[PDB]
Amino acid sequence: TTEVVMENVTAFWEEGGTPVLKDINFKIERGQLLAVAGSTGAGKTSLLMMIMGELEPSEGKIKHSGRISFCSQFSWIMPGTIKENIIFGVSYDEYRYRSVIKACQLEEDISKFAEKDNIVLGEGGITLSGGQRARISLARAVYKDADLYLLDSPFGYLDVLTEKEIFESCVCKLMANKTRILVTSKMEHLKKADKILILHEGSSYFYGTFSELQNLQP
Ligand SMILES: Cc1cn([C@H]2C[C@H](O)[C@@H](COP(=O)(O)OP(=O)(O)OP(=O)(O)O)O2)c(=O)[nH]c1=O
Numbered sequence: 765t766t767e768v769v770m771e772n773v774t775a776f777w778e779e780g781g782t783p784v785l786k787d788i789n790f791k792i793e794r795g796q797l798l799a800v801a802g803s804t805g806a807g808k809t810s811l812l813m814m815i816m817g818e819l820e821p822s823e824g825k826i827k828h829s830g831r832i833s834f835c836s837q838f839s840w841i842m843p844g845t846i847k848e849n850i851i852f853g854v855s856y857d858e859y860r861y862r863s864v865i866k867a868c869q870l871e872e873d874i875s876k877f878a879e880k881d882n883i884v885l886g887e888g889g890i891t892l893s894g895g896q897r898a899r900i901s902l903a904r905a906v907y908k909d910a911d912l913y914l915l916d917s918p919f920g921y922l923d924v925l926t927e928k929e930i931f932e933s934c935v936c937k938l939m940a941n942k943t944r945i946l947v948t949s950k951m952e953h954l955k956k957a958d959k960i961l962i963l964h965e966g967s968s969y970f971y972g973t974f975s976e977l978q979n980l981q982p
């Protein structure tokens with residue numbers, strides 16, 4: 765019933781360096797949303813890396829099981845069509861694909877190309893905007909079938925309202941039944957999350973709910 769657990773986790777990127785994560789604690793039940801916030805260098809991406817097994821803890825316990833889909837904070841494209849970039853070697857299903865591109869507002873973009881979903885990216889032709897590349901990268905991660913979705917600041921280059929709309933249509937509605945960790949700073953995302961973890965220089969600045977944090981004000 766619990767999907768991801770960290771208990772008293774401390775970790776280092778360099779032996780004898782300073783810890784990148786210090787005494788971190790959280791729990792996510794199946795289907796819940798954890799928001800992970802904090803300033804640059806706080807350890808948010810490192811926390812995701814530990815879940816993906818690229819960073820081993822020096823102290824503490826970690827629990828998680830199953831396939832992971834990871835959306836990097838650095839959007840990327842490979843040579844191929846926009847459809848191929850989103851499916852990215854996963855089996856194709858029209859309904860699933862269309863649901864994702866609609867939730868990511870990409871249907872609007874794609875409808876304007878004569879080649880539609882067969883427009884070729886990453887081969888010197890179309891030069892995508894930063895917001896387009898971010899929404900394609902998010903769609904790629906969301907299309908993949910996984911037990912756990914790790915979305916590392918996926919709303920790069922998007923204006924406030926577009927970010928809000930895609931957070932609601934993709935992360936909250938399309939992915940409503942999925943276990944999600946979303947690295948984000950935005951107030952509405954923290955308010956909608958089941959739990960919030962705010963990191964500061966590796967430490968747990970706050971862990972709880974948005975309501976609990978409100979109760980602390982005053
Ligand atoms: C991800 C990563 C971080 N680090 C170091 C860099 C930092 O000193 C520290 C924490 O880095 P990050 O985990 O990358 O911090 P962040 O993701 O919260 O920052 P941002 O909002 O800008 O994305 O770990 C490594 O040494 N190797 C790595 O692969």
Ligand SMILES: [Mg+2]
Binds near residue numbers: 809810837
């Ligand atoms: Mg990061």
